Amino acid sequence: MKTGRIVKSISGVYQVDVNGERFNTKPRGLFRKKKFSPVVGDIVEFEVQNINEGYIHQVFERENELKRPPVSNIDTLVIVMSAVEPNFSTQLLDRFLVIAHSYQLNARILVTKKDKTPIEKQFEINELLKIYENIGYETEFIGNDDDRKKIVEAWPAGLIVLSGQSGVGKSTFLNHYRPEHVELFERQNGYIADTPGFSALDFDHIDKDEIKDYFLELNRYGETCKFRNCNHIKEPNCNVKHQLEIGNIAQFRYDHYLQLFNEISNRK
Ligand SMILES: Nc1nc2c(ncn2[C@@H]2O[C@H](COP(=O)(O)OP(=O)(O)O)[C@@H](OP(=O)(O)OP(=O)(O)O)[C@H]2O)c(=O)[nH]1
Ligand SMILES: [Zn+2]
């Protein structure tokens, strides 16, 4: 009996990594049904057969998961944004953060293409990134003069998934891990996923009421709003509006919250 992570799902066979060693397995029990089907990222217990094969007996309860692509137990969602081509957008970033937190994921922020960003713009982006650091995120701003493999290995242990639009620079990182459905590649201290989590933006699962939970500073300062479910829009005695007023929440963050709050409700 062995325990490990699914790094590949190929026509119903599940490659499980156990500290480097690969085993090709098939589900048994409940796990043969679509409704309980294993997914890449799952931690499983399997019985070994035929030296490098096995039967999955148990799939451990998922800590989190994405549906498209289907991938589970992500330890850090790295949101990849370009500084230029296309221009850095707090509007897009904030949205990608809302999605990440709606899936219960640890997020961090990676801005790319520093080498081709005008230096005055670099300075403006660094200030913006400091706001995100204030909220609690780790941020990096990198370009072609940086060692992308040192960057990745210094990230937290476990499963990293990159998320961002085509063109931001994800493959440039991933090509460092390629043996050369989502597939996970090995890194020292974990894995990194071959597909992004959410190149695009899907809010369908999100209720207007949850949006404040996913703006972390609003959630935190919302603690001392008079109303326990204050949405920080028209309510009296609102600590988010107070903190906004005395400069402890950025106006753009509040503006984006409002926009999303109003947008989210609407019909598609
Ligand atoms: N200057 C600079 N460019 C970056 C950086 N990161 C990524 N790029 C470039 O941006 C483009 C998209 O990168 P990918 O790595 O393919 O992005 P993706 O997977 O998110 O879609 C590529 O350029 P391309 O269209 O292939 O043209 P070229 O730049 O290869 O000449 C890539 O080389 C960076 O940090 N600095
Ligand atoms: Zn409030």
- Per-residue DSSP letters for 152-193? HHTSPSEEEEEE--TTSSHHHHHGGG------EEEETTEEEE
DSSP percent split of the chain into helix, strand, coil, nearest 5: 35, 25, 40
Q: Which residue has the tokens 């919250």?
A: 257
How far is Cα of residue 97 from the mean position of the Cα atoms in its chain? 8
Length of the chain: 268
Q: Where are the alpha helices (DSSP H) in 175-250?
A: 216-222, 239-245
Label residue 103 exposed, middle or buried (CB < 10 Å: 0-12, 13-18, 19+): middle
Provide the sign of the torsion angle of the four alpha carbons 172, 177, 183, 188, taken in this order.
negative
Asked whether 153 and 176 are in contact (CB, 8 A), the reply is no
Q: Which residue has the tokens 């922020």?
A: 109
Exposure letters 2-26 (e unless 16+ CB within 10 A, then b): eebbbbbbeeeebbbbeeeeebebb
Give the separation between CA 109 and CA 132, rounded to whole angstroms. 9
Q: Which residue has the tokens 């293409």?
A: 113
Give the separation between CA 100 and CA 135, rounded to whole angstroms. 15
Q: What is the largest distance, in Å, between two alpha-carbon atoms of the chain?
A: 68
Amino acid at site 268: K
Of all protein residues, the one whose alpha carbon is nearest to atom 17 of ligand 1 is 169
Give the separation between CA 79 and CA 81, rounded to whole angstroms. 6
Beta strands at 65-66 and 53-59: parallel, antiparallel or unpaired: unpaired
Give the separation between CA 181 and CA 40, rounded to whole angstroms. 8
Give the separation between CA 133 and CA 93, rounded to whole angstroms. 13
Tokens at residue 258, please? 């409002």
Asked whether 244 and 232 are in contact (CB, 8 A), the reply is no
Contacts of 46 (CB under 8 A, 6+ apart): 1, 2, 3, 4, 16, 23, 25, 54, 55, 56, 57
Closest ligand 1 atom number to CA of residue 172: 15
Closest ligand 1 atom number to CA of residue 173: 15
Beta strands at 107-112 and 76-82: parallel, antiparallel or unpaired: parallel
Please provide residue 172's backbone torsions phi and psi, each rounded to the nearest 5 degrees.
-60, -35
Tokens at residue 226, please? 């008079």
Containing H/E element for 209?
A: none
Identify how the structure was determined. X-ray
Give the separation between CA 237 and CA 228, rounded to whole angstroms. 11
Contacts of 120 (CB under 8 A, 6+ apart): none
Of all protein residues, the one whose alpha carbon is nearest to atom 27 of ligand 1 is 167
Alpha-carbon Rg for the chain, nearest whole angstrom, is 21
**Resolution of the experimental structure, in angstroms:** 1.9
Tokens at residue 225, please? 């709003």
Containing H/E element for 132?
A: helix 119-135
Is residue 166 within 6 Å of ligand 1 at its C-beta? yes
Amino acid at site 256: H
Is residue 143 within 6 Å of ligand 1 at its C-beta? yes
Is residue 199 within 6 Å of ligand 1 at its C-beta? no
Label residue 158 exposed, middle or buried (CB < 10 Å: 0-12, 13-18, 19+): middle
Provide the sign of the torsion angle of the four alpha carbons 134, 137, 143, 148, taken in this order.
positive
